[PDB]
C-alpha cells in the first residue's frame, strides 16, 4: 500500500466503461444515476478530504437506491393513471392492438409433403370437400404459391409435427393462394386460413379497423385509443395505456362525499391504535428487559429466549390462529372465560371490544421488538449509578422511574415515533383478523370500525370494483405519509 | 449505628483482598481508614455498604446482621472514590435525591440543599449538569448528596482528594462540625495524613487486606505495632537502619550501627524476647532527628537531595556504609548544596526498634499525648 | 517542545473561565499549575492538548501555532484528572496501546511497558482491566500510559491525588528522575503543595480564569504578588491581620496593630503607593510566628483549636479585635487546652503587607534561596 490513485484510476475506468455503455441502448435513468453516485463516491475519497462523508455515503447509497428511489417512483406514478386499465405503455398498447388478429376466410387443415429435396403444401376445405395442392417449393423468405384443385394424393408421406415446427419460420412467410383467388396465410401448426390484421396504423399515427372501417386516434387525456368521426368518437378500445394525469386522483381524494365521510373517525382510531400499541409495547418490553438482567433472577437465560418467540415465528400464521382463539362462540379463549368467569366476550361483533382484541394481539406481536431493543440499550447505563441509587436508599421501583426509565426515553423516542408510523399503517394485522369488522353502517364506501386509514384506502383503490387503481393508491400513500410526517414532527 | 465487623473476609476467587478483619466501630465514633493504594479500603467500605459481598465472616450494623441485606435498606450513604453523579440530573437534583426519595416537602428539601451547597461553595453551580463541572467540583457534589441525605452511617471514600490546600482545610472543618452536630457514625477513607490525625477518634491502618493496627492518632505515631505502621504513618517516611543487638538489659536494648563510627546505644525498649546478635531494624523519624551539635550520638554523611518546601528544608543524607538515604527535617530555609558534608544527632529516647519478623518492641519512653 | 500561550481566552458562551492568559513555558522546564478547585487548570491543559477549542488568542507548541491542529499531531500526551482508561483493555493493553498503534515494535513495546509498570509497582496487575483495579491503581495506569509513550510535551492533571503518602513520594521521585533523564517540557497540575514545591522549575498560580503570578517555588512563598497568592501558597493559610498605616519611608512602612495595645511596628516593605491611615492587611505565616520569649512584638489571645499532627502541633488563637483566628505552628507535640491563654511573637521582617486592592507591598527583606 502506498497511493490510492492507482485504485481510483482503475475505478475511474469502470465508471465510464459502464456509464457510456448505459448511455447507449437507451437506459438513460440508469446512466444518469450511476454517474452522480460514482461522482459523489469518488469525490469524497479523493483530493477534497470529506472524511465524514466516507462513513455516511456507503450507507446513503443503499438507502437512496433501495428506499429513496422507491419513493420518488411511487410519487411519480401518483401523477398518472397507471392501473389495471391503463396498465401498458402507449407503445405496448399499440403493439398489442397491431397484433390483434381477425379471421375473414376459412380454416383449411394443411399438410406438408416432401417432393425429393423440395416440399409441397396441401389444403383441405372443411366444406365443399375440395382438396388443393401447390407446386414443389423450397423454404426461406416470403413467397406466394398457387394452389390447384387436386383430386389425387401427393407422393411422399405427410411430415411430422417436428418437421412442420422446425420449419415454422419459413412456413409462416408463405402466403398460399387458392384457384378461386383468395389469399390464405398460416394461422396454426395445423391450419392455413384467411386471418388478417384487425388494425393498420397510419404514418400520421391514426389506427384504422380493417373490418368495420372505424378510425381511431390516441386520447392522451384519458389514456385510450378513442374513435374518431369527421372530432370524437364515442368508442374506446382496450387495453388502454398509462399517461400523465397531473393533480388528478390527488384532487379526487378531496372531493367525494362518501370517501371523505368516515375519514375523520378512522383517523382517530389509527392514532389511538398505534399510540396505545407503542405505549404497551414499550411498557411491557422495558419491564421485561429489566427483569431479565436482574442477575438475582435465576434461570433468566431461559426466560430471555421464551419471551422472544412471539417474534421468532412469522406474523402471518400467528395472527391467523389468534383469529381462531378469539372466536366469539368457539375458540379456546372464550372456552375458559365461560368456564371460570361468566361473560363470553364478543371480540368481532362489538366494535369497542374488537378494537381491544387488536391491541392485545399487537402487544403480543410487538413487545419482543422493544425488549430486544431495551436489552442492549439498558447496558448503556453504568452499574455505579445504581450503586449511587442504593446509597440514597432506592430500588427497585424507585430505581426504575428515577434512573432506568428516564435514562432510556431519549434514545428510545425515535424508535417509538417510528413505531407509531409503522402501526399507523399496519395493514397486514387488520385484514387478517377483521376487514374493519364490524361494519360502520351507512357508509356508501366500504368502511368498518376496525379499519385503519390504510385498510379503508386499499379497498377504495384496489377493491370496490373499477379494477386495481395503482395511480389512486400511490396518491393516497403520499397524502397519509405527508399527514403522518407532519404529525410526527409535531 | 454501631457498625462492627467480625472476621470479615473477601476473596475474588483466588485474590484475597481482605483477611478475617476485626473492627468494632462504636456509635458516634469518627473512624478513618488508612493504607497503601491497593490494600482494600474501598473493599472494606463497600462491604459495609452492601455494594460488595462478604465471602466469610459477620457484619453487624446496630442490632442487625447486614451480610445478606440489600444496600438501600442498610440506612447508609456513601460518597464514592469515583463520584457516580447522576448525569441526567443537575447539581440541585443530585443533592436533593436521597431525601426526595425517603422523605418529602419541597420547602424542606430546597432549604437544606442551599444550606449544604453554601458550605461546599456550590451555590452558583446549582443548575449545572455534572459534565459541565470540574473534577473537584463534582467531588463536592458527591459529598453534598450524602450530607443532605443525613444517613444513619456516613461512609466517605477519599472525599477531599481533588481539592486545593485551602478548601481541603475548610471542608475538613465542615466535616468535623457535622460529626459533632449529628453524632452519626462516620467511616472515612483518606491518603492525607493531616485529615487522618485531625478528624479521627480512631485510625485503622490496613496492610494487604489484613488490619495492621487500630488506635488513636498519636498512639499510632508514637507507638506503632510493627515496621509497617511505623513506615506508613509520618509525612516523609521514618528512617530505617540495620542494627546489631550487642547486649540486652532489663528495660534497655543495646545496638550498634554498621559503619566506622562504632557507637553503641541503649534504647528504652520492651526488651522482652530479643535475640542477641540477631539483625534488627532501628526506626527514627526525620522530625525527631536533632542537629549534630546538640546530641551525643552522631551520624555523619553526604547530602544527596535538598528539597526546599519554604516552611522547612528536607535533606537526604547518605551514611558511609548504609543501603538507603537518611531523610532529615529542619525548620525554615536551610542553604545546603548537593554533595556537602552533613551531620545529625540521633536521640535514643525517640527511637523505634523492630524484630526480624517486623513486629515492634514497645517504646517504654513516655510521650506526650498518649495515656498509658 | 516549548509551549507558550498568547492572550488565550476560553468561554462557554457566557461563562468565561480563562481570560486572556499569557504563559511562557520554555523547553525542558517543569512547570506546575496550582489554583483553587474551579479556576480552570484542566481547561488550560485540554486547550494545550487540543481537546478544547481556544475561543480567542494563540497557542504555540515548539514555535508553531497549534489552535487548528488535531490532538494527535501536537506531540502532547496527557494523564487525565479522570483517568480515561480503556475499560475493554488490560493494564498492559492500555500502556501498550499508544506505540503499538503506529510503530508496533513488539520487542520495544513489551520491554518498556514492563519497565514503566515496574517503577509504578504495577508488575503484578498487568492482566487486569480497569474495573478490577483500585482508584489509585488506575491512576498509575493512566500515568504509565503516558510514560510508555514518552511524548515531547507532558500534561499531568492531578496524577497523585489518590495515592498513599509513601507511594506519592515514590512517584514524585520517579517523575523528577524521568524529567532530568529526558529533558522534556512537563505541565503538572497538582493540589498538593509539597509536590509543587519539590518538582517545579516554575509555578503558575491561577485565579478565576486569570494568571495570578508566575515564579520559582521559593519565589512565590517568600514574595507573593498579592493577597490571594499569599493566602494560596503555604500549608495552612497565611494569617491576615488588619492594620493602619502610621508612617512611611522609602525602605519601610510603619503600621499599627488593631488590638487595644496599638503596637506600632516598622516593616521592611515597599511603601510605594501607601498613604498614612489607609487600611492594609498584615500577612504572617504560621511557620514564621515566633515563641513569646524571643520576639519583641507580642500577641496574646485565647486558644480555640489545637490540632495534633505528630511531628508538629497547630494552635489556633483568637486574639481580641481580630475577626479571624491566628493559626500557629510549633515543632513537636505541645499539650494545650482549648481556652488557655497563649502568646506568640510577631516577626517584623517576615511580615507581608497588602493594599486595599490586595496588591502586595513588595518585601525588601532578603531571604535565602531566592536569586
Amino acid at each position: 500500500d502506498a497511493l490510492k490513485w492507482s485504485v481510483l484510476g482503475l475505478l475511474g475506468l469502470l465508471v465510464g466503461y459502464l456509464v457510456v455503455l448505459m448511455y447507449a441502448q437507451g437506459e438513460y435513468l440508469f446512466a444518469i444515476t450511476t454517474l452522480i453516485l460514482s461522482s459523489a463516491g469518488l469525490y469524497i475519497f479523493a483530493n477534497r478530504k470529506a472524511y465524514a462523508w466516507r462513513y455516511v455515503y456507503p450507507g446513503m447509497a443503499g438507502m437512496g437506491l433501495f428506499v429513496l428511489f422507491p419513493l420518488v417512483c411511487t410519487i411519480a406514478i401518483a401523477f398518472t393513471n397507471y392501473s389495471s386499465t391503463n396498465q401498458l405503455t402507449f407503445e405496448r398498447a399499440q403493439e398489442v392492438l397491431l397484433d390483434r388478429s381477425w379471421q375473414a376466410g376459412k380454416t383449411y387443415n394443411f399438410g406438408l409433403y416432401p417432393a425429393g429435396d423440395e416440399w409441397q403444401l396441401a389444403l383441405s376445405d372443411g366444406e365443399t370437400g375440395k382438396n388443393y395442392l401447390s407446386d414443389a417449393f423450397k423454404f426461406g423468405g416470403e413467397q406466394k404459391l398457387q394452389l390447384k384443385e387436386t383430386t389425387a394424393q401427393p407422393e411422399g408421406e405427410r411430415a411430422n409435427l417436428r418437421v412442420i415446427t422446425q420449419n415454422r419460420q419459413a412456413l409462416s412467410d408463405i402466403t398460399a393462394i387458392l384457384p378461386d383467388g383468395n389469399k390464405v396465410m398460416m394461422s396454426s401448426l395445423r391450419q392455413f386460413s384467411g386471418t388478417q390484421p384487425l388494425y393498420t396504423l397510419d404514418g400520421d399515427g391514426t389506427l384504422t379497423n380493417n373490418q368495420s372501417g372505424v378510425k381511431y386516434r390516441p386520447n392522451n387525456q384519458i389514456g385510450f385509443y378513442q374513435s374518431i368521426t369527421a372530432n370524437w368518437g364515442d368508442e374506446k378500445l382496450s387495453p388502454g395505456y398509462t399517461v400523465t394525469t397531473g393533480w388528478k386522483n390527488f384532487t379526487r381524494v378531496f372531493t367525494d362525499e362518501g370517501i371523505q365521510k368516515p375519514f375523520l373517525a378512522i383517523f382517530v382510531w389509527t392514532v389511538v391504535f398505534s399510540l396505545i400499541t407503542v405505549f404497551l409495547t414499550v411498557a411491557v418490553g422495558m419491564v421485561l428487559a429489566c427483569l431479565v438482567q436482574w442477575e438475582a433472577l435465576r434461570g433468566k437465560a431461559v426466560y430471555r429466549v421464551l419471551l422472544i418467540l412471539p417474534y421468532a415465528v412469522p406474523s402471518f400464521i400467528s395472527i391467523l390462529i389468534f383469529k381462531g382463539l378469539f372466536n366469539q362462540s368457539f375458540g379456546e379463549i372464550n372456552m375458559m372465560l365461560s368456564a371460570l368467569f361468566g361473560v363470553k366476550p364478543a371480540w368481532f361483533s362489538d366494535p369497542t371490544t374488537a378494537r381491544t382484541m387488536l391491541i392485545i394481539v399487537n402487544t403480543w406481536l410487538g413487545y419482543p421488538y422493544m425488549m430486544i431493543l431495551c436489552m442492549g440499550l439498558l447496558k448503556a447505563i453504568p452499574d455505579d449509578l445504581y450503586e449511587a441509587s442504593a446509597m440514597d436508599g432506592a430500588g427497585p421501583f424507585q430505581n426504575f422511574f428515577k434512573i432506568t426509565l428516564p435514562l432510556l426515553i431519549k434514545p428510545l423516542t425515535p424508535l417509538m415515533i417510528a413505531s407509531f408510523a409503522f402501526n399507523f399503517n399496519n395493514f397486514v394485522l387488520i385484514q387478517l383478523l377483521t376487514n374493519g369488522g364490524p361494519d360502520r353502517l351507512g357508509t356508501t364506501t366500504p368502511a368498518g370500525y376496525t379499519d385503519l386509514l390504510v385498510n379503508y384506502t386499499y379497498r377504495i383503490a384496489f377493491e370496490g370494483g373499477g379494477g386495481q387503481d395503482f395511480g389512486l393508491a400511490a396518491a393516497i400513500a403520499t397524502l397519509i405519509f405527508l399527514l403522518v410526517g407532519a404529525l410526527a414532527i409535531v | 449505628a454501631s457498625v462492627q465487623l467480625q472476621n470479615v473476609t473477601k476473596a475474588w476467587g483466588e485474590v484475597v483482598v481482605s483477611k478475617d478483619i476485626n473492627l468494632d466501630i462504636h456509635e458516634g465514633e469518627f473512624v478513618v481508614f488508612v493504607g497503601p493504594s491497593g490494600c482494600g479500603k474501598s473493599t472494606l467500605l463497600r462491604m459495609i455498604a452492601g455494594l460488595e459481598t462478604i465471602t466469610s465472616g459477620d457484619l453487624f450494623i446496630g442490632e442487625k446482621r447486614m451480610n445478606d441485606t440489600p444496600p438501600a435498606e442498610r440506612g447508609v450513604g456513601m460518597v464514592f472514590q469515583s463520584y457516580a453523579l447522576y448525569p441526567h440530573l443537575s447539581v440541585a437534583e443530585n443533592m436533593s435525591f436521597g431525601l426526595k426519595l425517603a422523605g418529602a416537602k419541597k420547602e424542606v428539601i430546597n432549604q437544606r440543599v442551599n444550606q449544604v451547597a453554601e458550605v461546599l461553595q456550590l451555590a452558583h453551580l446549582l443548575d449545572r449538569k455534572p459534565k459541565a463541572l470540574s473534577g473537584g467540583q463534582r467531588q463536592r457534589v458527591a459529598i453534598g448528596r450524602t450530607l443532605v441525605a443525613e444517613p444513619s452511617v456516613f461512609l466517605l471514600d477519599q472525599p477531599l482528594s481533588n481539592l486545593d490546600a485551602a478548601l481541603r482545610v475548610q471542608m475538613r472543618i465542615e466535616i468535623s462540625r457535622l460529626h459533632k452536630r449529628l453524632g452519626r457514625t462516620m467511616i472515612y477513607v483518606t491518603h492525607d495524613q493531616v485529615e487522618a490525625m485531625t478528624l479521627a477518634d480512631k485510625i485503622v491502618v490496613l496492610d494487604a487486606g489484613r488490619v495492621a493496627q487500630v488506635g488513636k492518632p498519636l498512639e499510632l505515631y508514637h507507638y506503632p505495632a510493627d515496621r509497617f505502621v511505623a513506615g506508613f504513618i509520618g509525612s516523609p517516611k521514618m528512617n530505617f537502619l540495620p542494627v546489631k543487638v550487642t547486649a540486652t538489659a532489663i528495660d534497655q536494648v543495646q545496638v550498634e550501627l554498621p559503619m566506622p563510627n562504632r557507637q553503641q546505644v541503649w534504647l528504652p525498649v520492651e526488651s522482652r524476647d530479643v535475640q542477641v546478635g540477631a539483625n534488627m531494624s532501628l526506626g527514627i523519624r526525620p522530625e525527631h532527628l536533632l542537629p549534630s551539635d546538640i546530641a551525643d550520638v552522631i551520624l555523619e554523611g553526604e547530602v544527596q537531595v535538598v528539597e526546599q518546601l519554604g516552611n522547612e528544608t528536607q535533606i537526604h543524607i547518605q551514611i558511609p556504609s548504609i543501603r538507603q538515604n537518611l531523610v532529615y527535617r529542619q525548620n525554615d530555609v536551610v542553604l545546603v548544596e548537593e554533595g556537602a558534608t552533613f551531620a545529625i544527632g540521633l536521640p535514643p529516647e525517640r527511637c523505634h526498634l523492630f524484630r526480624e519478623d517486623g513486629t515492634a518492641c514497645r517504646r517504654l519512653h513516655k510521650e506526650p499525648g498518649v495515656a498509658s | 517542545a516549548s509551549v507558550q500561550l498568547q492572550n488565550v481566552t476560553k468561554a462557554w458562551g457566557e461563562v468565561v473561565v480563562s481570560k486572556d492568559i499569557n504563559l511562557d513555558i520554555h523547553e525542558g522546564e517543569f512547570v506546575v499549575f496550582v489554583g483553587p478547585s474551579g479556576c480552570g487548570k484542566s481547561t488550560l491543559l485540554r486547550m494545550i492538548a487540543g481537546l478544547e477549542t481556544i475561543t480567542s488568542g494563540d497557542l504555540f507548541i515548539g514555535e508553531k501555532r497549534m489552535n487548528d491542529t488535531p490532538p494527535a499531531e501536537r506531540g502532547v500526551g496527557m494523564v487525565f484528572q479522570s483517568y480515561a482508561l480503556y475499560p475493554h483493555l488490560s493494564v498492559a493493553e492500555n500502556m501498550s496501546f499508544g506505540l503499538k498503534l503506529a510503530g508496533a515494535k513488539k520487542e520495544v513495546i513489551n520491554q518498556r511497558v514492563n519497565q514503566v509498570a515496574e517503577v509504578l509497582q504495577l508488575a503484578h496487575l498487568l492482566d487486569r482491566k480497569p474495573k478490577a483495579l483500585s482508584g489509585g491503581q488506575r491512576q498509575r495506569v493512566a500515568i504509565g500510559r503516558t510514560l510508555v509513550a514518552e511524548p515531547s510535551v507532558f500534561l499531568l492533571d492531578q496524577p497523585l491525588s489518590n495515592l498513599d503518602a509513601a507511594l506519592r513520594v515514590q512517584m514524585r521521585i520517579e517523575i523528577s528522575r524521568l524529567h532530568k533523564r529526558l529533558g522534556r517540557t512537563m505541565i503538572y497540575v497538582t493540589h498538593d503543595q509539597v509536590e509543587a514545591m519539590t518538582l517545579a522549575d516554575k509555578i503558575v498560580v491561577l485565579d478565576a480564569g486569570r494568571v495570578a503570578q508566575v515564579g520559582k517555588p521559593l519565589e512565590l512563598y517568600h514574595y507573593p504578588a498579592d493577597r490571594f497568592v499569599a493566602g494560596f501558597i503555604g500549608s495552612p493559610k497565611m494569617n491576615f491581620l488588619p492594620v493602619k498605616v502610621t508612617a512611611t519611608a522609602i525602605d519601610q512602612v510603619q503600621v499599627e496593630l488593631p488590638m487595644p495595645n496599638r503596637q506600632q511596628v516598622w516593616l521592611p516593605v515597599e511603601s510605594r503607593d501607601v498613604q498614612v491611615g489607609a487600611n492594609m492587611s498584615l500577612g504572617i505565616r504560621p511557620e514564621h510566628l515566633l515563641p513569646s520569649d524571643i520576639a519583641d512584638v507580642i500577641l496574646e489571645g485565647e486558644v480555640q483549636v489545637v490540632e495534633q499532627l505528630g511531628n508538629e502541633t497547630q494552635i489556633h488563637i483568637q486574639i481580641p479585635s481580630i475577626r479571624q483566628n491566628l493559626v500557629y505552628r510549633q515543632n513537636d507535640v505541645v499539650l494545650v487546652e482549648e481556652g488557655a491563654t497563649f502568646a506568640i511573637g510577631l516577626p517584623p521582617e517576615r511580615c507581608h503587607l497588602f493594599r486595599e486592592d490586595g496588591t502586595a507591598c513588595r518585601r525588601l527583606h532578603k531571604e535565602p534561596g531566592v536569586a
Partner: protein, 370 residues
C-alpha cells in the same frame, strides 16, 4: 423478451405440476420444443407485472375470474379453437373464458362446492334445505348437528342465497351487465332469511369459519358439511365413511354455487402462440394429457367431456360436476371486487344481527353500484 424455441408455463402449487411437465416432455419428444413448467408464489399477481413489460410465461394456468382482468389489461392473446374442438368441452365452461365476446383462455378443470355427508351419521342425505331443521333436531339429541359450514365467507353461503333468484351480475350473451346486480331482490333475500333462520333456531352458529367447520366433520361431530374437492384428502386421512352429492334444493330450486373453471390463457406478448395452442389443444386437453396431470394431483372435474365421463365413475367427481352445471359462473369482470366485500359484510351483519336481512342486502347492492 419471451424466448423463441420454447414454452414457459405457469401453474399453481396445488396443481399437478410434475405431471404437466410429463406432458411437456411428451410434447418435446414430438416437437423438439422444450416446456418449462414453474409454480411461483402469488403468480396471479406476478403475471400482470411481468406480462405488462412484454415478458412472463407463454401460457398461464389460473381461475377464469382473474383472466377477465388480464384480458382488459391486454395481457392475454385472443384464442381461436375450431368448431370441432369446442364441442369436446362442456359448453358452459366456454362462457367463463370469454371477455368482450371473444374467447381468451382454454377451460381445463371445473370446481364447485358440494354436499359432503357422513355415511354412518346420515346414510341418506336430504334433497332439500327446508328439511335441515328437522334433521338437526333429531341429531342434537345424540350430541351432534346436521349441517356445519363456513358462514363467514360469502363464497360458501352464496349457493343457498342464489338458489331462489340471487346472482352476482346478469349475463346478457357474452357480456355481463354491471348495472344489473342480484343481491337486493326476492331471491337473495329469501336465501339469507333462511340462513339466518338456521342460526335463530340454533341449528347453525353465526361465527363458524372454515377451519371450525372442517374440524367438526372430520371428527364426526357434524353429520354433513359443504366443501370443495380440495378438502377430500383431509377426510381421506380421517377414514370417515363419507359421500359427495348434489347440493340440497331451496324453494324447489337447486343451490347455485359459484363455478371456478381452471383456465389456460396465452400471453399476448408471447411469440409462441401457435406453439402453445397446439400444446394445449392436442397434448394437454386429451385423455392421456389430462390423465398425466390428474395422476400427479387430482384435478377433480374437467371440461373435456371425454375424460370427465371417465372421472365421473367416482361419484364425488360426478357430484361436483352436477353442482357446477346447476351453478353460476363467477363473473370475470373487475366489479366482483365490490361484490366480495359487500356480500361478506351483508351476511356478517345479518348473522350477527347487526342488520336485518332486507337492509343488509340493500346496502350491499348500493355498495356495488356507484
Amino acid at each position: 423478451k419471451i424466448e423463441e424455441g420454447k414454452l414457459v408455463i405457469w401453474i399453481n402449487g396445488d396443481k399437478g405440476y410434475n405431471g404437466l411437465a410429463e406432458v411437456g416432455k411428451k410434447f418435446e419428444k414430438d416437437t423438439g420444443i422444450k416446456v418449462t413448467v414453474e409454480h411461483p408464489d402469488k403468480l396471479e399477481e406476478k403475471f400482470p407485472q411481468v406480462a405488462a413489460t412484454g415478458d412472463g410465461p407463454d401460457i398461464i394456468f389460473w381461475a377464469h375470474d382473474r383472466f377477465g382482468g388480464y384480458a382488459q389489461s391486454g395481457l392475454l392473446a385472443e384464442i381461436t379453437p375450431d368448431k370441432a374442438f369446442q364441442d369436446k368441452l362442456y359448453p358452459f365452461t366456454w362462457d367463463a373464458v370469454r371477455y368482450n365476446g371473444k374467447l381468451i383462455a382454454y377451460p381445463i378443470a371445473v370446481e364447485a362446492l358440494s354436499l359432503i355427508y357422513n355415511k354412518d351419521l346420515l346414510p341418506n342425505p336430504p334433497k332439500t334445505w327446508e328439511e335441515i331443521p328437522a334433521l338437526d333436531k333429531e341429531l342434537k339429541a345424540k350430541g351432534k348437528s346436521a349441517l356445519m359450514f363456513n358462514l363467514q365467507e360469502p363464497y360458501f353461503t352464496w349457493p343457498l342465497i342464489a338458489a331462489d333468484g340471487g346472482y352476482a351480475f346478469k349475463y346478457e350473451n357474452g357480456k355481463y351487465d354491471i348495472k344489473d346486480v342480484g343481491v337486493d331482490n326476492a331471491g337473495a333475500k329469501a336465501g339469507l332469511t333462511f340462513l339466518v333462520d338456521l342460526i335463530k333456531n340454533k341449528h347453525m352458529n353465526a361465527d363458524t369459519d372454515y377451519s371450525i367447520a372442517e374440524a367438526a366433520f372430520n371428527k364426526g361431530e357434524t353429520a354433513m358439511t359443504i366443501n370443495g374437492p380440495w378438502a377430500w384428502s383431509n377426510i381421506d386421512t380421517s377414514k370417515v365413511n363419507y359421500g359427495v352429492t348434489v347440493l340440497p334444493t331451496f324453494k324447489g330450486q337447486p343451490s347455485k354455487p359459484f363455478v371456478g373453471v381452471l383456465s389456460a390463457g396465452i400471453n399476448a406478448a408471447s411469440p409462441n402462440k401457435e406453439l402453445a395452442k397446439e400444446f394445449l389443444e392436442n397434448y394437454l386437453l386429451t385423455d392421456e394429457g389430462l390423465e398425466a396431470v390428474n395422476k400427479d394431483k387430482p384435478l377433480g372435474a374437467v371440461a373435456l367431456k371425454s375424460y370427465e365421463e371417465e372421472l365421473a365413475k367416482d361419484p364425488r367427481i360426478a357430484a361436483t360436476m352436477e353442482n357446477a352445471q346447476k351453478g353460476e359462473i363467477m363473473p370475470n369482470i373487475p366489479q366482483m371486487s365490490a361484490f366480495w366485500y359487500a356480500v361478506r359484510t351483508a351476511v356478517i351483519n345479518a348473522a350477527s344481527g347487526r342488520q336485518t336481512v332486507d337492509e343488509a342486502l340493500k346496502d350491499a347492492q348500493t355498495r356495488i353500484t356507484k
